[PDB]
Amino acid sequence: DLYSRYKKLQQELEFLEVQEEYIKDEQKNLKKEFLHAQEEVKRIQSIPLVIGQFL
Amino acid sequence: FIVKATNGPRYVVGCRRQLDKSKLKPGTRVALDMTTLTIMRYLPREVDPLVYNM
């Protein structure tokens, strides 16, 4: 009954190593999209400003 | 640079390239673009020609 066991769990292990390598670069590329979002935040104040006061 | 034109509100803009920022003492009369609204040229002071008619 043994030979069925590592024919499941080895495939599970190599599938999990596949996505464990992928998710690292996923979380990497999220920070680049986050830096684009940062520049999108920063460019809201460059040329103008219209001074009011907080009420 | 914090400027207030005579016609209304207050604004914050910057120089172009060569506006020589040490000239801008607080209280000088300057020029502004209509659209871009940044500073163009430092200008001499007003005369208010009610003075000139007397």
From Swiss-Prot, chain A:
Compartment(s) of residence: Cytoplasm; Nucleus
Domain of life: Eukaryota
Protein family per UniProt: Belongs to the AAA ATPase family.
Role according to the record: Component of the 26S proteasome, a multiprotein complex involved in the ATP-dependent degradation of ubiquitinated proteins. This complex plays a key role in the maintenance of protein homeostasis by removing misfolded or damaged proteins, which could impair cellular functions, and by removing proteins whose functions are no longer required. Therefore, the proteasome participates in numerous cellular processes, including cell cycle progression, apoptosis, or DNA damage repair.
Subunit structure: Component of the 19S proteasome regulatory particle complex. The 26S proteasome consists of a 20S core particle (CP) and two 19S regulatory subunits (RP). The regulatory particle is made of a lid composed of 9 subunits, a base containing 6 ATPases including PSMC4 and few additional components. Interacts with NR1I3. Interacts with PAAF1. Interacts with TRIM5. Interacts with ZFAND1.
Name of the protein in its database record: 26S proteasome regulatory subunit 6B
Curated annotation (Swiss-Prot), chain B:
Protein's cellular compartments: Cytoplasm; Nucleus
Coiled coil: none
Domain of life: Eukaryota
N6-acetyllysine sites (modified residues): K4
Assembly description: Component of the 19S proteasome regulatory particle complex. The 26S proteasome consists of a 20S core particle (CP) and two 19S regulatory subunits (RP). The regulatory particle is made of a lid composed of 9 subunits, a base containing 6 ATPases including PSMC6 and few additional components. Interacts with PAAF1.
Function of the molecule: Component of the 26S proteasome, a multiprotein complex involved in the ATP-dependent degradation of ubiquitinated proteins. This complex plays a key role in the maintenance of protein homeostasis by removing misfolded or damaged proteins, which could impair cellular functions, and by removing proteins whose functions are no longer required. Therefore, the proteasome participates in numerous cellular processes, including cell cycle progression, apoptosis, or DNA damage repair.
Family assignment from sequence similarity: Belongs to the AAA ATPase family.
Name of protein: 26S proteasome regulatory subunit 10B
Protein's gene: PSMC6
Full protein: residues contained: 69 to 122 of 389
